[PDB]
């Protein structure tokens, strides 16, 4: 139950009972609609899909993504809706609720719900082994020429190859990751925000997936 889409606004803090400071990630979970209901009788699995942030309609000479194209008009026309930038399926929800076209508002969560927040990472670029992985660097003095290299990559001639999973350098990367068992502390209905306790992955104005905890 209880999935929603938003985007990271930033990070603040809130005081609670007996003055306890608790860190807070403001998520603007605005203008989410139920956009297609999926059934096991048609697809094999039960889910809805929620479109998050509406963008401008079809324009003939459109050269960028903020004007929808003709497949995204007709897809968001089968629901009485505007075309959305982000579209995600939620299959933990109950499919027998959520009529197609429902504005799934921000007051589906109450202060104190446990949730999972899914987002991409920041993305750091090409990084080395002691930054991409938590590797111990070599000594910076005493004659050494090994500082921030990876170490040995194998054994000599039994295993005359490098095994995969070696943890070599490359792209640190914005990949999807969930932080689990976060709390909702404050739902502002008029501002359409959620204050989730802690930090969620991604940069600012990113995209989150707040759904309830499977644990």
């Amino acid at each position: 139950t209880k999935g929603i889409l938003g985007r990271k606004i930033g990070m603040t803090q809130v005081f609670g009972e007996n003055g306890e400071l608790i860190p807070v990630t403001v998520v603007e979970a605005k203008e989410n609609v139920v956009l297609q209901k999926k059934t096991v009788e048609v697809d094999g699995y039960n889910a809805i899909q929620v479109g998050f942030e509406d963008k401008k309609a079809y324009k003939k000479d459109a050269k960028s993504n903020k004007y929808a194209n003709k497949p995204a008009e007709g897809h968001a026309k089968k629901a009485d809706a505007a075309p959305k930038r982000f579209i995600r399926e939620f299959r933990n929800v109950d499919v027998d609720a959520y009529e197609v076209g429902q504005e799934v508002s921000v007051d589906t969560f109450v202060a104190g719900d446990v949730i999972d927040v899914t987002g991409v990472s920041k993305g750091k670029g090409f990084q080395g082994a002691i930054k991409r992985h938590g590797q111990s660097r070599g000594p910076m003095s005493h004659g050494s020429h090994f500082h921030r290299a990876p170490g040995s990559v194998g054994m000599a001639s039994d295993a005359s190859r490098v095994f995969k999973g070696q943890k070599m350098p490359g792209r640190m990367g914005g990949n999807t990751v969930t932080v689990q068992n976060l709390e909702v502390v404050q739902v502002d209905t008029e501002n359409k925000v959620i204050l989730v306790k802690g930090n969620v992955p991604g940069p600012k104005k990113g995209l989150v997936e707040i759904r309830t905890s499977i644990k």
């Binding site: 803090q13 005081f15 007996n18 003055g19 306890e20 400071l21």
Partner: protein, 122 residues
């Protein structure tokens, strides 16, 4: 942050003036300590007389780190030196004349005797 081989002032009349840490007891691999953490330590500068003497290996609790502790209300506390009280392996001290301010965060570590023998606790 108090690790192995940090010199700490000794904050009572247990017989020691300076002490250096051997290990931070607790778990395995435990690197640092703050207020309320018991450390095992050898005294380096000792008062002539008293109880402990130079080269004894004593257990002792951290009071008032220089990199102090954070509280639940988002409050902080920091001190100008690292100090230390030699204890007597039941969370009770050796001396009766504990010097200097003690952080509040060792009331909940059952060091109530160290609090009562101290000046104003903050």
């Amino acid at each position: 942050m108090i690790q192995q081989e940090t010199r700490l002032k000794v904050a009572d009349n247990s017989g020691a003036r300076e002490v250096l840490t051997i290990k931070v007891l607790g778990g395995s691999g435990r690197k640092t300590a703050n207020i309320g953490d018991v450390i095992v330590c050898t005294v380096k500068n000792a008062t002539p007389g008293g109880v402990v003497k130079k080269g004894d290996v004593v257990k002792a609790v951290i009071v008032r780190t220089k990199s102090g502790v954070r509280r639940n209300d988002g409050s902080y506390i920091k001190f100008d030196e690292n100090a230390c009280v030699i204890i007597r392996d039941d969370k009770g001290p050796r001396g009766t004349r504990i010097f200097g301010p003690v952080a509040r965060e060792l009331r909940e570590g059952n060091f109530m005797k160290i609090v009562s023998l101290a000046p104003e606790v903050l």
